[PDB]
């Protein structure tokens, strides 16, 4: 599962990662709270999954752009511009 | 600031002494002045603060010769 993750998502390409990232940090973060999801139905590893999932995602966008150039000044700027244009919507399982 | 921009001259410390040796401290200042100078090329006024010896150096070696040794020029 761990060693697979590069072989998984280094294949999916940037504009695929947007909706992947957002769907990850959407539901299985947010929807699992609310009442802590059905009171005996946390599966608290899910918080362990998504937190580590999205962090592995965001590296790939970042670590790719180092090879191109960018260098953390432009990166922060385009993170604002991207982050500025989002619109939350119902996650999967709803 | 009591500094000639050309000569680099400052005021000097002096324990100016009585007849009895009961000293003080005071500054022997530089003989500065606000005065117009006359540029060779331009042929204009240049409103500068210079020493007296600065005048002597300028009359010795024409302004641009002296003024290269204090980088700033064209006012």
């Amino acid at each position: 599962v761990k060693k697979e993750d590069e072989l998984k998502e280094l294949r999916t390409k940037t504009n695929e990662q947007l909706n992947e990232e957002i769907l990850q940090l959407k539901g299985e973060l947010f929807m699992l709270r609310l009442q802590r999801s059905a009171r005996e139905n946390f599966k608290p590893s899910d918080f362990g999954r998504m937190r580590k999932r999205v962090a592995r995602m965001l590296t790939v966008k970042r670590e790719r752009e180092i090879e191109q150039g960018v260098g953390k000044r432009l990166s922060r700027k385009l993170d604002k511009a991207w982050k500025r244009s989002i619109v939350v919507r119902p996650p999967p399982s709803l | 600031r009591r500094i000639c921009p050309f000569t680099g001259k400052k005021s000097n410390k002096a324990n100016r002494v009585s007849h009895s040796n009961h000293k003080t401290k005071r500054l022997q200042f530089v003989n500065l002045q606000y005065k117009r100078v006359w540029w060779e090329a331009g042929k204009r006024f240049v409103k500068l603060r210079l020493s007296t010896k600065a005048l002597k150096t300028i009359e010795k070696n024409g302004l641009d010769a002296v003024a290269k040794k204090a980088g700033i020029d064209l006012r």
């Binding site: 957002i22 940090l25 709270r33 009171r39 619109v87 939350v88 919507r89 119902p90 | -």
Partner: protein, 91 residues
């Protein structure tokens, strides 16, 4: 250029679950939530409306003295908060 301070997708921490909130669900037709301290009314109404696909007559917010912002989110006469909140585990 939208948000006073940019924050996140996230914002909403959790709904408050207590005896006052349950009564306010029935009386005012309104939800109650804990949000970001740097969350705006505009930001909350854009989030919750765009999340559940429901309308928001008004939001009214305060900062309980520890420094965590809690918001009353009121809903139109059309949309029914009792049944909405029933399917988010508050009833």
């Amino acid at each position: 250029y939208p948000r006073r301070i940019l924050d996140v997708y996230q914002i909403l921490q959790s709904p408050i679950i207590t005896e006052a909130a349950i009564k306010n669900i029935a009386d005012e037709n309104s939800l109650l939530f804990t949000v970001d301290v740097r969350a705006d009314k505009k930001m909350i109404r854009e989030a919750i409306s765009n999340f559940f696909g429901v309308k928001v007559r008004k939001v009214n917010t305060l900062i309980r003295p520890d420094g965590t912002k809690k918001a009353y989110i009121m809903l139109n006469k059309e949309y029914n908060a009792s049944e909405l909140a029933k399917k988010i585990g508050i009833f």
